[PDB]
Homo-oligomer: A and B are copies of this chain.
Amino acid sequence: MVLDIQLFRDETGANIIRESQRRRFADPDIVDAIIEADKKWRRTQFLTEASKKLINICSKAVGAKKKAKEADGDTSEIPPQVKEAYENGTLKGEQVEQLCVLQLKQLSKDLSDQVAGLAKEAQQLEEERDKLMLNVGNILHESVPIAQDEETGNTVVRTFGNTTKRAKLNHVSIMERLGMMDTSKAVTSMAGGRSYVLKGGLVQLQVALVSYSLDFLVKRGYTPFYPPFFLNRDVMGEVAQLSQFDEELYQVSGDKKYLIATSEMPIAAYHRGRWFTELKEPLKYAGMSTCFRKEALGIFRVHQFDKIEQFVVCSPRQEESWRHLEDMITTSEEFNKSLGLPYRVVNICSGALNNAAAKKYDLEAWFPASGAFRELVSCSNCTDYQSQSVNCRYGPNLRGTAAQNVKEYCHMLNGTLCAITRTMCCICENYQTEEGVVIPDVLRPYMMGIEMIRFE
């Protein structure tokens, strides 16, 4: 599954999607292409269901005739009118019951052949529909700025700290002068481009950030979550876009798997096929993992890095996920304030939002030596978009419930707490002195009380 079809089949729902597509500067016609694919698919299902019923009628009629010792019949030849009728889904059981045993057996095989053919048609139509659904964005929140370009379109909502201060050395220069980061040929000749070795104080800092970040979420009611770093192709497909396979994900062999780009992928996949009847309290996870990105100076943008993630699974009702989004961006803000890092928070414009996000806040920290705001955090409300793909249902789940006009799904949200390597770059720029890098106060107990890491 990619998206639930229910909204597309409703006139009001289809218009809500079309409007969201226009507001995202995306194609509204994708909604119409999905409805048409679904109409063709529903036709194969109608015929399959009708023909499965007629196969059971054939079997029961043969059984009745064999019991009554009725002669098997003159021929197995099916009347062309009968063939035309089951191909059009109009063949009545009363007409099937007029056939002899020989014809009922032939018809049962003919109907089974039709079902096999229709299943192949339905598979091709599901593939077409699913490909179209991948280009459908989540329904935008009403507060999303309407713009195509990030540069002009994003809205700065909040700022913190001294965002105009300048510093001498950038993170690359500082990490070089510490003697604690090696990105030379000694590393790239063994591990490929953009690979690195961290040593000494920088490793102590990395661990101090992992542990401080995890404790920071534990204190706020998140459950630590350590995932597998591998996902199979099928499962990865449910939590990643097609474009992520070609540009971002490494393939692992030795049954093909993919390395995770963030703990958001295995945490969302962990809820696949789940059904929470009620979520009086939301599910809050503190994901901890290495992240691997194909990405198709220094350690600002690398293939391998640690990240502490906020992940929330909540009720889809009473706009609760919107309250969680505000709490999650606030947590990322509080975290950066605790490190004494200046920043701004931006509300991402409609044209720049990834398909799963109904709204996204980025926290961009100030890099005083680089002289720029740089993204450290992304916090998104994915509402029920990922839940439809992984099939994570919500609501009453009782015996006797029929094909419900409205299937409810959980809401899911994800947000960076700390992308470790990039935070270390930001810390190095903001805490540099002539002697080295001052360790932010809150991190000192997490790294043996060390107050500064010195230039070599």
Contacts and interface: CB of A to CB of B under 8 A. Distances in A.
Contacts of A254: 249-251, 294, 296
Contact of A290 (B187, B229, B231, B303): B229
A189 interface: yes
Interface in A171-227: 186-187, 189-192, 195-204, 206-207, 210-211, 214-215, 218, 223-227
Interface in A211-262: 211, 214-215, 218, 223-232, 235, 249-255, 257, 259
A104 interface: no
A150 to B, nearest CB: 26
Contacts of A229: 290, 292, 304
B200 A224 contact: yes
Contact of A270 (B186, B206, B231, B296): B186
Contacts of A303: 230
Counting chain A residues whose Cβ lies within 8 A of the other chain, the interface size class is: 35 or more
A154 B231 CA distance: 40
Interface of A: 186-187, 189-192, 195-204, 206-207, 210-211, 214-215, 218, 223-232, 235, 249-255, 257, 259, 266, 269-270, 272, 286, 288, 290, 292, 294, 296, 303-304, 446, 448
A225 B197 contact: yes
Contacts of A215: 448
A296 B202 CA distance: 36
Given A252-B250, A254-B249, A230 B199 contact: no
